[PDB]
Amino acid sequence: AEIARSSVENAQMRFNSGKSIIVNKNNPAESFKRLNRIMFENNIPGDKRSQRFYMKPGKVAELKRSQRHRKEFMMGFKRLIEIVKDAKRKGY
Amino acid sequence: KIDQSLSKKLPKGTIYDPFDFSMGRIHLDRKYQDIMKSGANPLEFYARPRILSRYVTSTGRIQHRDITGLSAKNQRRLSKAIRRCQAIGLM
Amino acid sequence: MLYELIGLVRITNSNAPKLEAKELSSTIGKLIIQNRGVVRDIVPMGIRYLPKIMKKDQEKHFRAYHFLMLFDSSAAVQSEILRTLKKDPRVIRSSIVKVDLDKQLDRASSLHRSLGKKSILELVNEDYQSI
Amino acid sequence: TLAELLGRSRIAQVANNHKPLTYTGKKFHPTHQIIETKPSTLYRQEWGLKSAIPSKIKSRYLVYNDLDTLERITTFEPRGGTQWNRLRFQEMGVPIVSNIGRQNPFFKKFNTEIIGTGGLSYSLPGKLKVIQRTVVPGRILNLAAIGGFVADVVFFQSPPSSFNSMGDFIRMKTFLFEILEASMEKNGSVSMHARLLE
Amino acid sequence: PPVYRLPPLPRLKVKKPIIRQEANKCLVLMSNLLQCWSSYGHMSPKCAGLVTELKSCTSESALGKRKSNINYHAARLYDRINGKPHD
Amino acid sequence: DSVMRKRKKKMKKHKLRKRRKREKAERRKLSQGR
Amino acid sequence: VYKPKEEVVKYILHGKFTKNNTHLTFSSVVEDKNFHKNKGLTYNDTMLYYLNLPQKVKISLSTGCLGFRKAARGEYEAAFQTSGRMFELIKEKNMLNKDIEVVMDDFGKGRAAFISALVGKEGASVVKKVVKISDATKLKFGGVRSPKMRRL
Amino acid sequence: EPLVLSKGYNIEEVDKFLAAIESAKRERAELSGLNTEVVGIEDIEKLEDRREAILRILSMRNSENKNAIKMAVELARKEFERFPGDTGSSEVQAACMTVRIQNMANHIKEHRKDFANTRNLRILVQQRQAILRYLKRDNPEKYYWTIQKLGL
RNA sequence: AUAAUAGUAAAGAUGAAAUAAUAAUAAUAAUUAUAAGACUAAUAUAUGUGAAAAUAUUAAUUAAAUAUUAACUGACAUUGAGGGAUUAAAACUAGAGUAGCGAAACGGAUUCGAUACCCGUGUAGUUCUAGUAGUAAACUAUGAAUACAAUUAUUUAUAAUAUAUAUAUAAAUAAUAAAUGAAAAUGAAAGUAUUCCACCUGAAGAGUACGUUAGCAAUAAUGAAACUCAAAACAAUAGACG
């Protein structure tokens, strides 16, 4: 009670999660956008969409594998194009 | 007065070059921009919910080995320590 | 074998925060002892608001007094200790994890092991200095 | 012997080093050895590397890490040009205390730590070129890069108008500075002081 | 750590290499009208200081406005960058 | 050939329909005391 | 023993911005400088209350209310135009005296709008009194299963 | 039996090794320039417990069945060996597989649906037999000696 | 789902709509609060671990599974007819449970028709417990074992070095050489060889009939012939087509 009324709600001075982005008043877009980042960086949004229709476990595993493969080629492609750019720059 | 994204501020310690003093350079740098990573049984920290709090997307989520980039064993033991810490009251 | 119990006890004494915690620390102990087994290292971890409001016995404990006891007993006594714990209304979220000593004759508490240490005999000469 | 020949090969005279050719890390000491080529070889497009350097390169100085690599090319950056910074240190004419030179001027089984001037200086500390040095012009960072070496600008009185005169082009503007002195922290980093004549 | 060699491909071209060109400048102008017409009503007493812009955007050309060279760079620097074994 | 395998499917399904009709005859007077 | 003592604290504007409809709900916390004027409850008790102060919906609003009906209740116009009403109402009911937090939930086309509307012009007089934005999308950790895949 | 322990720790060696400390402690002080006071009994009480704990912390009644087995295989090898050391003799190998075959079995007599470890028990049995079959093809005398010895 | 609460008129679903016990009994949304079940995000590559089924929420116990030396054993093996053991999803027999899902069912859509796709309820079942049964594209469509053969890059295990380096080993994964191959392609095997087991000998009829065994049953295994054709199948190619 009193002993903790002083407790500045110690609790809520760092109590919640990352699902929050205090707004620096003034700029509002940025703040709202700051959430767009967290949201789009904890994949929260996309997961909701997935957790809508559950495919057979083998089917979802296959999909996951395919996604992984796609990811790995994209960064393999990126690596290749960076080398190509370097070669262009140098003279090769 | 000027914006940040346009003015390298090499510390004096370094070796500034004629190009180094250029925008190209600024762009270049951007492009090319951990006691656990050191080698301590990440599982031993099965409690200390402080240490584990680090490699965490701050959403009760561990990270793919694209960010954490910890050793397979280190990351898996860190993940196990986080999961074990969930069992160990704190975190 | 060597076990560990990072249990989180509840508190009610606006006054003493380590009342029950200590009282339970006695209980568990008394029994870890009267049964062939050595208590080893106790490392009061004090208090830390629980990340979530952990409702125990419909009390919704938003905080708990973490504590740790490094002990050693047969499976049964170790198993039995689990039973005691969950079934102790005071404790809120218990846990006994193993500490195999196959390699190191004496193992420290998980905590010190992440502090760089590894053994009590080590952690003792670590303080021995004085006399 | 084949090996004897290679053991003296200029290719091996150059040690190996896989340090990145971008090194975004703060730089104090050089990372690789520049390969100098006589203008002749440049037209002959010869650089002594595993593969010939592309005509696109028109410098006579390049730095290489991989004679050749899986990508079927040599990993080199034709931007090797430290030749300028170190020479400018000579253009600046200032010696380094180098802590205490017990017996040997640089003093010190292996002198890995406190390597010394680091080949940035091989001249007697005291000389009369000091005659108040030679107020070498430097590019004020706010600190002032003199001859590729930043030196903290010092002055009898703070002159804001001087900074206002160059506005945001303080680094673009170059002011002569009577270098107070420089020093090589064991991490091979030179710390120096400038004399803003404003 | 970083490392991801690819498998041989017909060619490592790039899809629609996105060079980036601003959205029909007019499209932004017409949009702001409806970004200041939703409120304040049609031809907002404020939008006078707006339609002034969407005027000539049309006029002669109702649509004020009715590349890249990486594919060859790729075609030429792939049979070199790809770490294919010998043959 | 998958199409050929699918035909088995049509044939097994057809036989399953016959089995259902045969199932009526099964467990009946024929399979009891006879 | 005291009697109710209510001094609303912050104001909460919440919404479930789903695909087929968008909802906005303005609520107000509630409090009392009395809970602790009683020695019967233990110290813990009080914080529990504080940690989770009560709450009262003050302006339930859904796209359809503003006019749209059926499919349309899922588009953008709806939200942009079913937000203003919400805000406009926070004004008339004289509810802008203390801070307000936002909690965009789910991701129907409406979320963006209610976020445009807050920032742009119709949010103006309100935005100002908003503290921290946030979010409460509900994702499940396995949990229960979800519809088969509509072979749409 | 009571007082047994792990990793070669016969209680006697403990009694004699623990004892070494007694001799050492006192004799450390005999020399130098420090006198003898509380060390008249060095807390017989404290040392008595020290050893005691050691015993609880090294008592098979408080260790792991695996450890009891580590002891056993030895016992058997040493009852079936051909000479000090031999650990490859068919009977030694058989005897060793025997100890386990039991453990494994009592294990299965609880986890009746554990099948993988059931495959194990069997493979072993099939295996012991295979080596036992070899010894009856070699030192036949030994074979029968051994089998009747192990109980088959 | 269920009250508590305050709030108002729609809610919800779809291509768009209908309905149902949706909501003027005050709904949905909100926020608290009880109860009941299933499941287990990231990490997470099924990397891996398992004989194969399978298998990534946490811990406890039990058990198996590693490398390298060292001591021993002394060919004790290679794998195998038959047999035995395990064996996904569905199904079944008991007993409990039953949130969500969802055969069947019934209703609403759409459509020319719609016993479908779409949508609303939603029962057998999906869960556990003890069983039973023994089949899957149980697929790497590739039986097991041993000896051997040309490179590279990554994992990575691991010894070593004068750990943090560049080295020697293995192991896996990815590109290939040779070789093989109807080609697709295989790549330390689909190569070079040796050993052992299983199985095939045109298509239909047919894994059907019948007999026999096993099962509570559905069924599972075993498994013919007559009749009729000069067909039937696969990889590579053009071309037409979507």
Residue extents of the structural domains in chain C: 2-124
Report resolution (Å) to 1 decimal: 3.2
- D118 burial type by CB count under 10 A (0-12 exposed, 13-18 middle, 19+ buried): middle
Q: Which of residues 28-67 of B touch D (CB under 8 A)?
A: 28-29, 32-33
Return chain B residues 35..74 having CB < 7 Å to nucleic acid strand I.
39, 57, 59-65, 71-73
C-alpha G65/C-alpha G22 separation (Å) is 11
- Residues D63-101 as b or e (16 or more Cβ within 10 Å = b): bbbbeeeebbbbbbbbebbbeebbeebeebebbbebeee
Which tokens go with C15? 């006054």
Q: What are phi and psi of E75, to 5 degrees?
A: -55, -30
C-alpha D64/C-alpha D53 separation (Å) is 10
Choose among B36, B68, B74, B71: nearest CA to B55. Answer: B68
Which tokens go with G20? 């087929």
Per-position DSSP letters for H65-102, written without gaps between them: HHHHHHHHHHHHHHHH-SSTT---SHHHHHHHHHHHHH
From the candidates G36, G42, G44, G49, which should be mutated to test the interface with C, based on the most C CB atoms within 10 A? G44
Contact indicator for H99, H73 with CB cutoff of 8 Å: yes
Contact indicator for B51, D182 with CB cutoff of 8 Å: no
The reply to whether G18 has its C-beta less than 7 Å from any atom of strand I is: yes
Distance of CA C112 to the CA centre of its chain: 14
C-alpha C80/C-alpha C89 separation (Å) is 16
Q: What is the CA radius of gyration of chain G?
A: 19
Q: What are phi and psi of G131, to 5 degrees?
A: -90, -110
Contact indicator for C50, C62 with CB cutoff of 8 Å: yes
Contact indicator for D188, D30 with CB cutoff of 8 Å: no
C49 at the A interface (CB within 8 A)?
yes
Contact A10 C49 (CB under 8 A): yes
Q: What is the CA radius of gyration of chain D?
A: 21
Residue type, G127: V
- Residues H90-116 as b or e (16 or more Cβ within 10 Å = b): bbbbbbbbbbbbeebeebbeeeeeeee
Q: Which of residues 95-154 of D touch A (CB under 8 A)?
A: none
Per 3-state DSSP, what percentage of chain G is helix, strand, and coil (rounded to 5)?
35, 20, 50
Q: Which secondary structure element, helix H or strand E, spans residue G68, and what is its range?
A: none
Contact indicator for H58, H9 with CB cutoff of 8 Å: yes
- Residues B30-63 as b or e (16 or more Cβ within 10 Å = b): eeeeeebeeebbbbbbbbbbebbeebbeeeeebe
E85: left (phi over 0), alpha (psi -120 to 50) or beta: beta
Contact indicator for H69, H99 with CB cutoff of 8 Å: yes
Contacts of G47 in chain C (CB under 8 A): 62
In sequence order, which ranges of chain H are alpha helices (DSSP H)?
11-30, 44-56, 65-80, 90-108, 116-135, 140-150
Residue type, B21: F
Q: Residues of G near E (CB-CB distance < 8 A)? A: 80-81, 120-122
Return chain H residues 60..79 having CB < 7 Å to nucleic acid strand I.
64-66, 69
Choose among H89, H83, H101: nearest CA to H151. Answer: H101
Contact A54 G145 (CB under 8 A): yes
Protein CB footprint (7 Å) on chain I nucleotides: 5-18, 27-34, 37-47, 50-53, 57-64, 71-77, 85-87, 99-102, 117-119, 130-131, 137, 141, 151-157, 163, 166, 174-177, 204-209, 217-219, 233-234
Q: Nearest nucleotide (C1') to the CA of residue B59?
A: I42
Q: H8-15 contacts: CB < 8 A, separation 24 or more?
A: H9/H58, H11/H55, H14/H51, H14/H54, H14/H55, H14/H58
C-alpha D176/C-alpha D188 separation (Å) is 25
Which tokens go with C86? 């969950």
Under 8 Å CB-to-CB from G54, ≥6 apart: which residues? G29, G30, G31
Q: Give the 3-state secondary structure of residue C7.
A: strand
Question: Checking DSSP bridges between strand A20-21 and strand G133-134, what pairing results, if any?
Answer: antiparallel
Q: List all chains that touch chain A, counting a touch as 3 or more CB pairs closer than 8 Å.
A: B, C, D, E, G
Q: What's the DSSP call for residue D121?
A: -
What CATH number does the domain located at C2-124 have? 3.30.70.60
Return chain G residues 114..143 having CB < 7 Å to nucleic acid strand I.
136, 141-143
Which experimental approach was used here? cryo-EM
C-alpha G79/C-alpha G62 separation (Å) is 9
- Residues H16-42 as b or e (16 or more Cβ within 10 Å = b): eeeeeeeeeeeeeeeeeeeeeeeeeee
Q: How far is CA D106 from CA B37, D30, D49, D114, H133, in A?
A: 38, 20, 35, 9, 80
Q: Please state, as a whole number, how many other Cβ atoms lie within 10 Å of the Cβ of residue B3.
A: 7
Q: After which residues is chain D broken (C to N over 2.5 A)?
A: 108, 129, 142
**Å between G136 CA and I90 C1'?**
40
C-alpha C116/C-alpha C110 separation (Å) is 10
Q: How far does chain E reach from its first CA to its final CA, in angstroms?
A: 30
Q: Please state, as a whole number, how many other Cβ atoms lie within 10 Å of the Cβ of residue B75.
A: 20
Choose among A20, C53, A48, A64: nearest CA to G141. Answer: A48
Contact indicator for G118, G129 with CB cutoff of 8 Å: no
Q: How far is CA G85 from CA B3, D198, E39, G79, G116, in A?
A: 40, 64, 12, 10, 14
C-alpha H6/C-alpha H72 separation (Å) is 11
G29 at the A interface (CB within 8 A)?
no
Contacts of H59 in chain C (CB under 8 A): 36
Choose among D188, D194, D181: nearest CA to D125. Answer: D181
- For residue G133, the cross-strand partners are A21
Q: Give the 3-state secondary structure of residue G88.
A: helix
Contact D70 E83 (CB under 8 A): yes
Contact C14 A11 (CB under 8 A): no
Q: Which secondary structure element, helix H or strand E, spans residue A37, and what is its range?
A: helix A29-41
Q: Which of residues 32-71 of G touch C (CB under 8 A)?
A: 42-44, 47-48, 51-52
Contact C49 A15 (CB under 8 A): yes
Q: Nearest nucleotide (C1') to the CA of residue G24?
A: I29
Give the residue from chain E lying closest to D72, CA to CA: E80
C-alpha G82/C-alpha G113 separation (Å) is 9
Chains H and F touch (3+ CB pairs under 8 A): no
Return chain C residues 32..61 having CB < 7 Å to nucleic acid strand I.
55, 58, 60
Q: How far is CA C95 from CA C29, C30, C71, C82, H64, in A?
A: 15, 18, 12, 7, 20
The reply to whether B91 has its C-beta less than 7 Å from any atom of strand I is: no
Contact indicator for D34, D57 with CB cutoff of 8 Å: no
Choose among B46, A7, B88: nearest CA to C67. Answer: B88
CA distance G48 to chain C (A): 7
Q: Give the 3-state secondary structure of residue G19.
A: coil
D56 at the A interface (CB within 8 A)?
yes
Which tokens go with E44? 């907002």
Q: Residues of A near C (CB-CB distance < 8 A)? A: 1, 3-4, 10-11, 15
C-alpha D174/C-alpha D137 separation (Å) is 6
Contact indicator for A52, G147 with CB cutoff of 8 Å: yes
Q: List all chains that touch chain H, counting a touch as 3 or more CB pairs closer than 8 Å.
A: C
C-alpha angle with apex D123: D118 to D125, nearest 5 degrees?
100
Residue type, G20: N
Q: H123-130 contacts: CB < 8 A, separation 24 or more?
A: H124/H97, H124/H100, H125/H101, H127/H97, H128/H93, H128/H94, H128/H97, H128/H98, H128/H101
Residue type, C12: T
Three-class SS of chain E: CCCCCCCCCCCCCCCCCCCCCCCCHHHHHHHHHHHHHCCCCCCCCCCHHHHHHHHHHCCCCCCCCCCCCHHHHHHHHHHHHCCCCCC
C-alpha C101/C-alpha E64 separation (Å) is 79
Q: Nearest nucleotide (C1') to the CA of residue H67?
A: I62
C-alpha E84/C-alpha E6 separation (Å) is 10
Choose among C52, C5, G26: nearest CA to A17. Answer: C52
Which tokens go with D186? 């064991």
The reply to whether E10 has its C-beta less than 7 Å from any atom of strand I is: no
Q: Which secondary structure element, helix H or strand E, spans residue D63, and what is its range?
A: strand D61-66
- For residue G134, the cross-strand partners are A20
Q: How far does chain F reach from its first CA to its final CA, in angstroms?
A: 44
Under 8 Å CB-to-CB from H65, ≥6 apart: which residues? H103
Three-class SS of B29-81: HHHCCCHHHHHCCCCHHHCCHHHHCCCCCCCCCCCCCCCCCCCHHHHHHHHHH
Q: Please state, as a whole number, how many other Cβ atoms lie within 10 Å of the Cβ of residue G19.
A: 12
Which tokens go with D168? 């945001």
E81 at the D interface (CB within 8 A)?
yes
Q: What's the DSSP call for residue G110?
A: H
The reply to whether G14 has its C-beta less than 7 Å from any atom of strand I is: yes
Contact indicator for C98, C1 with CB cutoff of 8 Å: yes
Counting Cα atoms < 13 Å in the Cβ hemisphere of H123 gives 6
Chains B and A touch (3+ CB pairs under 8 A): yes
Contact indicator for G40, G128 with CB cutoff of 8 Å: no
**Å between H152 CA and I135 C1'?**
40
Contact E81 A80 (CB under 8 A): yes
C-alpha G84/C-alpha G63 separation (Å) is 11
**Å between F4 CA and I232 C1'?**
11
- For residue G57, the cross-strand partners are G27
Q: After which residues is chain C broken (C to N over 2.5 A)?
A: none
Q: How far does chain C reach from its first CA to its final CA, in angstroms?
A: 32
The reply to whether G65 has its C-beta less than 7 Å from any atom of strand I is: yes
C-alpha D152/C-alpha C116 separation (Å) is 41
Q: Please state, as a whole number, how many other Cβ atoms lie within 10 Å of the Cβ of residue H45.
A: 9
Under 8 Å CB-to-CB from B32, ≥6 apart: which residues? D20, D22, D24
Three-class SS of C75-111: HHHHHHHHHHHHCCCCEEECCEEEECCCCCCCCCCHH
Which tokens go with D78? 């034709």
